[PDB]
Amino acid sequence: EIISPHHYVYPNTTTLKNKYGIKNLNAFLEKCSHDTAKAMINLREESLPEYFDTAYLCHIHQQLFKNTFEWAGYLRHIPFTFADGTTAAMPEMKRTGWKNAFAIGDEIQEGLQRLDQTLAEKNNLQGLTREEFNSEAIELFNSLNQLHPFREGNGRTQRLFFENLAKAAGHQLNFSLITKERMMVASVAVAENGDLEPMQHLFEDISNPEKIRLLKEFMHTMKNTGRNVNDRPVMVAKEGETYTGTYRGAGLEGFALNVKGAYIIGNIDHLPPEQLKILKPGDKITFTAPK
Numbered sequence: 645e646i647i648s649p650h651h652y653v654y655p656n657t658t659t660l661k662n663k664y665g666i667k668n669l670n671a672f673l674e675k676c677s678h679d680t681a682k683a684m685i686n687l688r689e690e691s692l693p694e695y696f697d698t699a700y701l702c703h704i705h706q707q708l709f710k711n712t713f714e715w716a717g718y719l720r721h722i723p724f725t726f727a728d729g730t731t732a733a734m735p736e737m738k739r740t741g742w743k744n745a746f747a748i749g750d751e752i753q754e755g756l757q758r759l760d761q762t763l764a765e766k767n768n769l770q771g772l773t774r775e776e777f778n779s780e781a782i783e784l785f786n787s788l789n790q791l792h793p794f795r796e797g798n799g800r801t802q803r804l805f806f807e808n809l810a811k812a813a814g815h816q817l818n819f820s821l822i823t824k825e826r827m828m829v830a831s832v833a834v835a836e837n838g839d840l841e842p843m844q845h846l847f848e849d850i851s852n853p854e855k856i857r858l859l860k861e862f863m864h865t866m867k868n869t870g871r872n873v874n875d876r877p878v879m880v881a882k883e884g885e886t887y888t889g890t891y892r893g894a895g896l897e898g899f900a901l902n903v904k905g906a907y908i909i910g911n912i913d914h915l916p917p918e919q920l921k922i923l924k925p926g927d928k929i930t931f932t933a934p935k
């Protein structure tokens with residue numbers, strides 16, 4: 645057909661059409677990675693907007709991908725004619741039938757107008773306590789996650805939309821402290837079971853100053869190690885829960901565990917004073933977060 649999803653990609657390849665003219669998937673992904681990283685640095689310096697609507701969501705995407713994709717600012721239900729003449733649009737997405745699916749066609753527009761409508765009615769979530777703000781933000785975040793409004797680049801732009809919404813509303817949501825894996829599990833939990841607990845946990849860790857300082861400390865230790873924790877879920881221990889694993893070493897404010905490929909982080913003062921004395925790296929330890 646004239647308007648086809650196949651028109652997003654170079655023929656015979658799996659690699660999206662790009663402003664660089666690169667057809668090798670790996671080469672393209674490296675160039676994109678480099679360019680979008682520069683865009684973030686500048687985007688994080690621009691002033692906050694007055695309105696947080698989809699126009700702003702689009703501005704972000706447009707600014708991030710201006711040098712990579714011709715359709716940078718564009719939502720995926722709106723037919724887009726490339727410079728080369730072909731016209732593309734992906735209303736569907738097509739998961740496997742058994743997977744939970746994103747919104748189709750005009751649902752994208754219904755959903756997004758709704759998101760704009762609620763943020764306007766609630767003055768961008770502005771006069772609220774942290775629990776009030778986090779509760780409202782989680783609905784909107786989950787909501788926007790199921791719309792998957794752009795063909796690609798949803799994650800980064802969604803993350804920066806909310807980091808900025810929070811900042812404007814007098815709160816924090818440092819998404820840079822969340823790995824790609826943790827976001828994946830939290831999103832999957834909500835889309836499959838309707839389970840909010842992982843996300844609540846995620847936002848809690850990202851907004852509570854007492855837990856943000858714990859993560860900042862840990863993420864620092866990764867700097868110049870050669871490693872990449874993006875593969876690995878990094879969390880602050882939930883209050884009440886019990887974690888068991890192997891000791892990864894302490895700091896001033898907090899320590900780290902390894903529980904089946906995941907880093908759990910705890911306040912140093914929650915350890916029994918007498919354990920801390922004789923506890924070396926690699927020691928098996930059970931820990932329970934207090935009230």
Ligand SMILES: [Mg+2]
Nearest residue numbers: 796797798799
């Ligand atoms: Mg991606």
Ligand code: NI
Nearest residue numbers: 645648650651
């Ligand atoms: Ni065609």
Ligand code: NI
Nearest residue numbers: 675678679682
């Ligand atoms: Ni460069």
